[PDB]
RNA sequence: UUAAUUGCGAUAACGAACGAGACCUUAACCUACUAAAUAGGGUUGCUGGCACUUGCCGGUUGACUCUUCUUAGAGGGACUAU
């Protein structure tokens, strides 16, 4: 069932380091902000004309070191960048200048999260801590509880929780081999998740916000319930799964293995498609793996940022 | 000196154009300018790294030496 | 003339042998790891140490290499060592329960006072010219 | 193989010490941080001249503001990285 084929449609050249992270806003479907190892963000405008799927719009210089995680705002006009210089930068997606410079992490920041609304900034850093900031730039909360580095923090979207609660729930993980849930208003702990043999490389809550997918070094992908606080399922990728991403339309998990990109069909608990682009002049032992994954707003296109300094887009083209 | 100043103005004008286009114009224009520039006298956007070598005793030059008598 | 003298090589070897699960393929991540898990005095030596650690990690990923060892590799070696075939490689499981011996060892078996299933065959005393 | 008794190694040699390297000073690169009437810049004053269109080149220790260059501290950066 669902004989869905996805084919590479364009390549977004222009970066100069590994495209570490990607982000897309639901409101604005034709804009894509990508941060790379070249210490710069790039805003891409997507064109449905010919070979190139997008067009770079603005490069955001101002970061001294590696840019790890990139998050766009809900409205699609602001972008928060986490870099390896222990600082966070807020950028106006049109002006190109920085608005706020969040400072306070003693270790280089690895991930950043946007609030459901435009209120709070959640940042994870190597200093074993999480920081909650306002949009102005000051740090409101210093959440502890992790004894090692925290690599990924992405907010669980509130779908239909009771009506309304004014409570902000997200997850956090890193080299502590644990996954933690946090609730904000106040701004304290929630349930835990201990399933990983090795340390967690990346976590990503489902678009609805009730499934949390975590991945690690051993390629052991775990899927948990947050609102139920229980395990949902478990698979093995048998490679290095660098990044993973849910899909808005389909019930799918893209996983960036060290060898290629797997897609897991969640309802059938079986992988369906594998993505391995064709490079040239290599030795098949160091083919550029994927480090960043991001689906489109609808769930029609997939953006993958590789170590070959390239964004490649796979458009879903169901060949019957 | 004179020619050093001239090359400084060259670099200043080129880098100013590129930075302005990056800041307020567009990415494609900036990359086109960089392709036009760096394909011609790479120093136009990249500062030269060669600079004078400190002098040393026993030599009237930075790397030269005095004459030897030998007899 | 970059040869990476004793100190960096030994330090990287110990780093791999004590921290292989945490080490990665990337230079920058391993650089931060070197900063956190080891007290390298200067930073040029830290960078050299991380670079050689990455090189040794890449060599290990390509395959097993001499000198360095760690828990995972030693466990895999022991597991491969514990391999014993369930099928028998002796006691005439092959050659339809017949072993081929010449006359002399047949007389050896006879004079030993033992009756084993033998199969006499002359050894053609003519020797190969090599 | 290395500039190197520098390493890979083979081994009645095993472990080590000095030297080399490491290390400091200096020269780079920092539109990232801290800042500056004993360094510079912008806007605006108060003026000079020419143009006459709102602009150009100036002067002022008059104000507001900034740190790109100039400085110097903490740091980053290159480890033969891919
Ligand atoms: Mg001279
Ligand atoms: Mg400066």
From Swiss-Prot, chain B:
Region annotation (Disordered) ranges: 51-71
Feature: compositional bias, Basic residues: 62-71
Species name: Kluyveromyces lactis (strain ATCC 8585 / CBS 2359 / DSM 70799 / NBRC 1267 / NRRL Y-1140 / WM37)
UniProt name for this protein: Small ribosomal subunit protein uS9
Family designation: Belongs to the universal ribosomal protein uS9 family.
């Amino acid at each position: 069932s669902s004989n869905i084929m996805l084919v590479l449609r364009g390549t977004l050249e222009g970066h100069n380091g590994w495209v570490t992270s990607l982000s897309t806003s639901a409101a604005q479907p034709n804009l894509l902000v990508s941060g790379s190892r070249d210490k710069t963000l790039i805003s891409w405008r997507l064109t449905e004309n010919e070979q190139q799927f997008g067009v770079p719009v603005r490069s955001y210089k101002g970061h001294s070191h590696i840019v790890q995680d990139v998050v766009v705002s809900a409205d699609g006009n602001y972008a928060v960048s986490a870099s390896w210089d222990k600082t966070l930068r807020l950028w106006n997606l049109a002006t190109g200048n920085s608005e706020a410079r969040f400072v306070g992490h003693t270790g280089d920041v690895l991930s950043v999260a946007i609030d459901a609304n435009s209120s709070k900034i959640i940042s994870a850093s190597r200093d074993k801590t999480i920081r909650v900031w306002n949009t102005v730039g000051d740090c409101a909360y210093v959440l502890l509880g992790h004894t090692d580095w925290v690599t990924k923090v992405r907010v669980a979207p509130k779908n239909l929780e009771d009506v309304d609660d004014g409570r902000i729930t997200f997850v956090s993980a890193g080299m502590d081999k644990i996954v933690r849930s946090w609730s904000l208003n106040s701004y304290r702990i929630e349930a835990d998740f201990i399933g990983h043999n090795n340390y967690i490389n990346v976590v990503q809550p489902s678009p609805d916000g009730s499934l949390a997918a975590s991945a690690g070094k051993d390629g052991q992908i775990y899927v948990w319930n947050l609102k139920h606080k229980s395990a949902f399922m478990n698979f093995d990728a048998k490679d290095e799964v660098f990044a993973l991403a849910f899909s808005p339309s389909r019930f799918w998990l893209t996983a960036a293995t060290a060898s290629g990109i797997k897609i897991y069909d969640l309802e059938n608990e079986v992988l369906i498609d594998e993505l391995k682009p064709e490079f040239a002049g290599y030795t098949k032992a160091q083919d550029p793996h994927a480090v960043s994954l991001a689906w489109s707003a609808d769930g029609q296109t997939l953006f993958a940022g590789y170590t070959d300094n390239v964004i490649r887009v796979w458009q879903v083209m169901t060949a019957n | 000196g004179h020619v050093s100043q001239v090359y400084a103005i060259r670099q200043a004008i080129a880098k100013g154009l590129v930075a302005y286009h990056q800041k307020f114009v567009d990415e494609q224009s900036k990359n086109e300018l960089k392709k036009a520039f760096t394909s011609y006298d790479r120093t136009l956007l990249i500062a030269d790294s060669r600079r004078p070598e400190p002098k040393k005793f026993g030599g009237r030059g930075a790397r030269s030496r005095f004459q030897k008598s030998y007899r | 003339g970059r040869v990476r003298t004793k100190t960096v090589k030994r330090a990287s070897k110990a780093l791999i042998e004590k921290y292989y699960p945490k080490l990665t393929m990337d230079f920058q991540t391993n650089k931060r790891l070197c900063d956190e898990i080891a007290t390298i005095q200067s930073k040029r030596l830290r960078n050299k140490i991380a670079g050689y650690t990455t090189h040794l990690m890449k060599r290990i990923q390509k395959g097993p290499v001499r000198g360095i060892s760690f828990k995972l590799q030693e466990e895999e070696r022991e597991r491969k060592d514990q391999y014993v075939p369930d099928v028998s490689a002796l006691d005439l499981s092959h050659s339809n329960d017949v072993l081929n011996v010449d006359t002399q060892t047949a007389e050896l078996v006879n004079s030993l006072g033992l009756k084993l299933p033998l199969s006499v065959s002359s050894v053609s005393a003519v020797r190969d010219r090599r």
